[PDB]
Every structure is written in structure tokens, then in C-alpha cells.
Amino acid sequence: CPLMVKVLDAVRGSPAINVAVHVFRKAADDTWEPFASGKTSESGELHGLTTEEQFVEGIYKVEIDTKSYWKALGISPFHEHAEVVFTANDSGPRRYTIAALLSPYSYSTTAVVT
Amino acid sequence: CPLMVKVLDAVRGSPAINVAVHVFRKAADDTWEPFASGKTSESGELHGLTTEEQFVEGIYKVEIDTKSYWKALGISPFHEHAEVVFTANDSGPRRYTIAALLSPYSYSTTAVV
Amino acid sequence: GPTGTGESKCPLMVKVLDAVRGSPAINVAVHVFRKAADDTWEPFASGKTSESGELHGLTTEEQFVEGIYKVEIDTKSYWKALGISPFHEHAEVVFTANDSGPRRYTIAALLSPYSYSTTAVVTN
Amino acid sequence: CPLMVKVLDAVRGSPAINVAVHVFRKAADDTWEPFASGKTSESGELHGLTTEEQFVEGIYKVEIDTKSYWKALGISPFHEHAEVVFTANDSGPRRYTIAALLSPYSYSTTAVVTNPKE
Amino acid sequence: CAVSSFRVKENFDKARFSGTWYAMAKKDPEGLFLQDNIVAEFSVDETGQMSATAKGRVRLLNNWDVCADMVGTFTDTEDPAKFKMKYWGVASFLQKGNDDHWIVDTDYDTYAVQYSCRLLNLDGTCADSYSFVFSRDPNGLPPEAQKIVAQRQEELCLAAQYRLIVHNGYC
Amino acid sequence: CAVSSFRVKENFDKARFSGTWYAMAKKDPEGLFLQDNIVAEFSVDETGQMSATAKGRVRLLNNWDVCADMVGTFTDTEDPAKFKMKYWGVASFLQKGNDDHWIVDTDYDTYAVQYSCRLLNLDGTCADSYSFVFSRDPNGLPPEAQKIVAQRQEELCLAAQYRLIVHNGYCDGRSERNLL
Ligand SMILES: CC1=C(/C=C/C(C)=C/C=C/C(C)=C/CO)C(C)(C)CCC1
Ligand SMILES: CC1=C(/C=C/C(C)=C/C=C/C(C)=C/CO)C(C)(C)CCC1
């Protein structure tokens, strides 16, 4: 398996459970296209987004639904959502790992390329 | 100097000088339309973007070209650019400063209203 | 059968990442200490990070009693062998533990020559 | 101007006002001995911590109280305090800016000033 | 004031005080405490350990509101009244700690009165405590109780120094 | 400079170029570039794709020397000479791009040129570039080849400058020596 998506809470120090995630791929026409969807599990993770064969090159944009995660907490954020735009299998199939540590007013995104 | 954007290197523990920044204001048609732009000064800040009465409540987005910034540095980055979405509500406090901490594979942002 | 027996679900777990190469920090030193009855730091658990950037088995349930502990990660070494003069001599995390009952802690540290951040994933 | 520390509250996305800050400088004997201290103003910044000819080469540790801050909000935190140890070398640049970003279970930190001297 | 010598509940009897209790008043300790819909379930385990699991809403962080689920273990001491508690949120970020936890009075079935100063003013019995007014039924207490919970708040020190707690479905 | 004013190897045969090539003189194209201890390795592969995978030492990030391990694929064209190589680092953080990669001459047996302009002058023809001067033995070329590799740097708008392409048993692995 290739892509993965981890999300964690920076206020309850606990994974970020049931967090919708939407992936898109820049199309031939500079237009984003739906490529994958899903929601974090009880372990902050979101498996089986894509297959290697399917996973081709191009810019991909992971869009994390933070704003309703935060709101459903009973807290109002400052961010609408988190975005992570990068290029993939640009020089040969790799296995990506996207992590995200969420705060109401400040988050961050790392990327482990294997 | 409201809506002052800042940037920091984590790798050269220094200010991200000359970091192109473009802001956008979500239009009626759910489309992003240029709002203001520039580059971070020698200290890593970029003020003079807007004005109290141009800056109304709504949804703008702050685009950070970071690859062009690692690209000068001989480092080929993971990210394509560091985007920023949030809504501007008069709700109360209107002094916005969205910072950014840049590294070739991770980056973090925060605000101070 | 033996006395003092239980499960083997790693209570503690350190994890280091590389902000510059986008890889897990492998072969990083991590020394652990527990405030003594006399305000004295005592050595607790030593170890280096795997190919994973993960250090497993640094302690046991029974052996992890409540109190304060420390987790020093010598970033200075990592960066130098590489060819980079860092700013921090090392990264320190000081916290209490199993304060209100036993709990599973996971300390992750993202590394950057002039910056580093730490977080804790813990759950009941 | 000597070492301007600055805090930031990530949950509140504001400035960590009234945060205590004690700084130490390793003594001969390998011990820490008080160097200066104070509290973050209304902006979340700490200035007036020392001077050009008192701030000498060596190893410094900065200690920031986050717990207090947090319990003062009412949230229990992870840490016991955040620490920052670093070599103050006459090396080149000497303008140091020490920042922190605090949330209940995590905090980061960066430093600045480069070596403008070919 | 004078925290000690406040002669507390007598031949206390854990078990008999192991029902359910509801809030009704409150003393404002310094800092961030519980808020409203303050109920508590007193249990007990063979061993003799008198536990007690509270339920309540507190003004956590500026706005945000959370109905915090709390727990608490009690460790004996002379008087059968007194106790030593070490509470903790089943969930993190929830003020863990230890506090005095006497039981000033209580017929077990109807009213009770709990006091707890955790710091003492310069040698000199107490300087800032929090007290709860509990009662079996969430409606109120007859004329008798009230006339005692009233003639305690004087002994225990506080008279009127309270502020009844509502309980609008929230937790 | 300017472009299309000069040549490139005739029916150059990739299969008879294949072998190791030792840098000896470079060019200073704008922005960081490959340091010293620059050694090729040009492979093919049934289909015909002419690969290559040159190592080197780079000035990366201020004062952090790293012996970079590249790799670059090539895509044909019309004149067997010029190709289309997209280069990337066996490891991230390693400036990856696509540059035009001719072959301004050679004799696949010690001493083959190379060119590349990725910016053209006010429709004049050629702004920036970069160039390398190869030979198969790291000790220098005969009096003939260096005769030509000195003729072709005046026919090659901007062929050989020759910065200190310094070979010095550098990217060892058995004792790090300097890197990873
Ligand atoms: C354990 C416990 C006691 C106190 C609980 C407290 C004092 C909870 C405080 C919660 C804090 C304020 C949460 C902060 O987020 C009471 C007396 C009800 C009796 C039995 C249960
Ligand atoms: C791929 C490649 C070419 C150029 C590689 C370059 C231009 C590498 C640049 C490396 C960068 C500077 C590293 C930055 O860290 C040469 C012409 C040797 C021929 C075959 C191999």
C-alpha cells in the first residue's frame, strides 16, 4: 500500500477521529478533480485511499476537514480547513505519509517519503 | 501594519526573505480573486497589504510559494505552496498576523487575533 | 506460574522525524530520567531510534510508576554527522506520568536545524 | 534587542501574556546559574533581558512556564515547562529571537539572526 | 474560618452515603471549578475504598463549553468523616489533583455538606475553600434539612457565601 | 550567448558512448550546481533509452557538504545528438529538473563534450547554459583531444570554462569521510 493520512488532536492529545478527508488531482486542464475521499479511524488514520497502479503522477491536493471536527468539539477554529499541495511519483513510485497535528488557531503538516 | 504576514526558516533559523505572497478574496461566484501581494522583507514580514476599510468580513486565502524558496537553496521540496483559508469576521478583534514556519518537508502556521 | 505478569503493549514510545530530508530520524540518542526523591535527575531509559525513527521498549508497566520523567534527544549529534551546525544542543521534554492511573504515552519530535516541535498522543 | 523571547497561544491564536521566563547560563562547574527573568507583556514578548557585554559566549538555557499559563485557562497540559539550550557563539550574528507556540499537548520553537558577514 | 476543629460528620458510614447526590449551592474556590449540572455518584469496593464519580459543566477556555466527566478516589484518615481525594478527568486536560474532602454533615438520605480548604492562611486554619450542598432529590430539601444546611454554613463558615447551581440538561 | 549556430555529434551512437565519463572542466550556469568528484555512468536498456547517473559533491545550504547521487533519463529527438533528460535525486531535497542535453562532439573513447542552455536571449538566441568536458581516463587527454576540446569551446557558444572540477577520492562510503 502507498498513500496514508494521519491526523492528531493538539488539545486533547489523542488521535483525530472521524475526520473527513478529500483528495483531488490537477487535471489536464488546470482543474482539480475528485480522486479520493474517506474519514480517519479510531486511530487517526485513513487507509485505502488509492492503489499504486491508480496512483499516477500529477499534483495531488489533500484537503482535510478540520473546521467541523473543531466545531463538533464545541470550539471555533480560525482555519476553514487544511490544505497540502504537492507533486507525486514525479521520479518513480514512492509511499507517502501525511501527518497533521491540529490546533484551533495553529496546525502543521509533515511528509515522510519512502 | 495589520494583516502582517511573517515567515521563518527552521533550517537556517532565519527569516524567509523574498517569499512571494498572494492573497485572495473568495468572490460571490465562489471564485478566488486577487486581493494584494508582495514579498517578505529582510526580516520576514510583509505588511502594507490592505486597509481597515478594504478589509471587510469574508473569506480570503494566503498563498506561500515555498518551493521557489527552497529552489534558490538547492533543495527540492515536498510541497507545492503553503495555502491559507480562514474567514474575516468583525466578530471583535481585527488585527491579523498569520505566521509560517518552513522546512523542506513540514510547515506550520498560526495566527494572533 | 510467575508473579508480576501482564500484557506487552508498549506503554512508552519515542518517534523522531527529519524536517530536511522528509525521513524518520534513525540512530538518534535518547536518555530518560526520573526526578528523584531529592530533586535529583536519575537515569531511567537509554536507546537509539531504529530504521523507523522509533524507539521501543524503554520501560515496563510495572516499572513505570507515577512521577516526573525526562526525555532528552541529542539533536546536536544527528545534524553534525550530517554536515549541519544546529542551534539547539538537544531537545528536552519534561512531564509527569501515570499521574491518575497508568497511561500509554507517545512522544514524537519533528527535527529542523533551528527549530523542532514536540507533541504527545495519549489516551485512556 | 539582546534576546527577545516571544510566546504564542495556539489554541487561542493570540499572545501568551504574563508568561514567566527564567534564563540560565552554564557555569564553570556545569551548573545553571540564573541569568535574567520576567514575564511576557500584553503582546507576548520579552525584552530587556540583558546587554551586549554581559551576554557572553557560552551555553544558555531558556525556561518557559506553560503549565501555569494553561491551568490559568483551565486546561490540564502535558509538559512541566518548555526548555531551550543553545550555544551563544561570537561566531558572527548576535541578534537572537527565541519564539514558542504553545497548545495543551505540544510546542515548537525557532531562533533567528544569521551571519551577515562575508 | 479555622478549617481544623470544624467537628465533621460523626460516626460517618461510607456505604450509607453511597447513593446519589445532587448539587444545590457552591462556594467559589479560586480558579476554574465545575459549573452546573453538578451530580455525583458515590460507590464503594469491598476493600473499603469510598469512591465518587462527579458529573459537571465548566467554563473551559474562554468560551468553549464541556460537560466534563470526572472521577475520584478517597484514602482514609483518622476521623471517619475526612478523606484524601485524588481526582481525575476520564479525559486529559481536566484539572487533576488532590483536595481535602471532609463531609461536614449528612443524614445520608436528603442533605449533606462537604467542605475543603486546600491552602491555609498563614498558620491559621484555611484561606480559600470550595463547598458543595448536596441533596438526594433534585427538587429541594424540606424545612428541617435547610434549617441545618443553614446552621452549618455558619459553623463551617460561609452563610450565604454560596450561589445555587441550575441544571439545564447539558451533561 | 546565442543558439543553433553550432553543431552536435553526427549519428552519435549512444551504445558506443555508454561507458564511464570523467568530468574535467565545467561551466558556471546560474544557481547552485554539481561541485567536484563528478562522475558519470551512462547506461541504455533494450528499448533504447539512454540513461545516466552522475554522482558529485554539492555546496548545498550554506555549509553542509553532501555527495549527491543523481540519475537522469533521456528522451530522443530529431538529431541523434540532442536529447531530453529529466534528472532527479535518488534522494529528495535534490534539485530535480529537465535540461536540454546535447553532446557537442566526442569519440566515445576519452574526451566528449556536452552543452545545455535553458534560457534564450532577447530572441537573440542563448542566455544561460552550463557545460561539462568529459574524457574516459581521469588523468587527462592526449595532445590531440584537448586540441579539439579547445576548438569546440569557441564553436560551442559557451562550451568549456572549466571551474575546478576537482576529483579527489571523495564520496567514499566506507568511512563517510564527508557526508551522510
Ligand atoms: C472528584 C470529585 C470531586 C471533585 C471533582 C473536581 C473537583 C473536578 C474538577 C474538575 C476540574 C475543574 C475540571 C477542570 O477542567 C467531588 C467533590 C464532586 C466529589 C466526588 C467527585
Ligand atoms: C543528472 C546528470 C547531470 C546533471 C546533474 C545535475 C545538474 C545535478 C545537480 C545536482 C544538484 C545541484 C544537487 C543539488 O543538491 C549530468 C550533466 C552530470 C549528466 C548525467 C547526470
Coordinates of C-alpha atoms in Angstrom, one line a residue, chain E residues 67-158:
Chain E
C67 CA -19.6 18.6 30.2
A68 CA -16.5 17.1 31.9
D69 CA -16.7 13.5 33.3
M70 CA -14.7 13.3 36.5
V71 CA -13.6 10.5 38.9
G72 CA -12.2 10.5 42.4
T73 CA -10.5 8.0 44.8
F74 CA -10.7 8.5 48.6
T75 CA -8.0 7.4 51.0
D76 CA -8.9 7.2 54.8
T77 CA -7.6 9.2 57.7
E78 CA -8.5 9.4 61.4
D79 CA -12.0 10.8 61.7
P80 CA -14.4 8.6 59.7
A81 CA -15.5 11.9 58.1
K82 CA -12.4 13.4 56.5
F83 CA -10.7 11.9 53.4
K84 CA -7.9 12.4 50.9
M85 CA -9.0 12.7 47.3
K86 CA -7.1 12.4 44.0
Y87 CA -9.5 13.1 41.2
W88 CA -9.0 12.9 37.5
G89 CA -10.9 13.5 34.3
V90 CA -11.5 10.3 32.5
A91 CA -10.2 12.7 29.9
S92 CA -7.0 14.6 29.9
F93 CA -6.9 18.4 30.1
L94 CA -9.3 18.0 33.1
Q95 CA -7.8 19.5 36.4
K96 CA -6.3 16.5 38.2
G97 CA -5.3 16.9 41.8
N98 CA -5.8 16.2 45.4
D99 CA -8.1 18.2 47.8
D100 CA -9.4 17.9 51.3
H101 CA -12.8 16.3 51.2
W102 CA -14.4 16.2 54.6
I103 CA -18.1 15.7 55.0
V104 CA -19.3 18.2 57.5
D105 CA -22.8 16.7 57.9
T106 CA -25.4 14.5 56.3
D107 CA -28.3 12.2 57.2
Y108 CA -27.4 10.2 54.2
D109 CA -30.8 10.4 52.7
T110 CA -31.6 14.0 51.8
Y111 CA -28.9 16.6 52.5
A112 CA -25.1 16.6 53.3
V113 CA -22.4 19.2 53.4
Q114 CA -18.9 18.9 52.0
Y115 CA -16.0 21.4 52.9
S116 CA -12.5 21.6 51.6
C117 CA -9.8 24.3 52.1
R118 CA -6.6 23.3 50.3
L119 CA -4.3 26.1 51.4
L120 CA -4.2 27.6 54.9
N121 CA -3.9 31.3 55.6
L122 CA -0.5 31.9 57.4
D123 CA -0.6 29.4 60.2
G124 CA -4.3 29.8 60.8
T125 CA -6.9 27.3 59.7
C126 CA -7.7 27.8 55.9
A127 CA -7.6 30.7 53.3
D128 CA -9.7 29.6 50.3
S129 CA -12.0 26.5 50.0
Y130 CA -14.9 25.2 47.9
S131 CA -18.1 23.7 49.3
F132 CA -20.9 21.8 47.8
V133 CA -24.5 21.5 49.1
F134 CA -25.9 18.0 48.2
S135 CA -29.4 16.6 48.5
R136 CA -31.0 13.3 47.4
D137 CA -33.9 14.7 45.3
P138 CA -33.1 17.5 42.8
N139 CA -36.1 19.5 43.9
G140 CA -35.0 20.9 47.2
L141 CA -35.0 19.9 50.8
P142 CA -37.7 20.0 53.4
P143 CA -38.0 22.7 56.1
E144 CA -35.8 20.7 58.5
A145 CA -32.7 20.0 56.5
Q146 CA -32.4 23.6 55.0
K147 CA -32.6 24.8 58.7
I148 CA -29.4 22.8 59.3
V149 CA -27.5 23.2 56.0
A150 CA -28.2 26.8 57.1
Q151 CA -26.9 26.3 60.6
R152 CA -23.6 24.8 59.4
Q153 CA -22.7 27.3 56.8
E154 CA -22.2 29.3 60.0
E155 CA -20.1 26.7 61.8
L156 CA -18.2 25.6 58.6
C157 CA -18.2 29.4 57.8
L158 CA -20.0 30.7 54.7

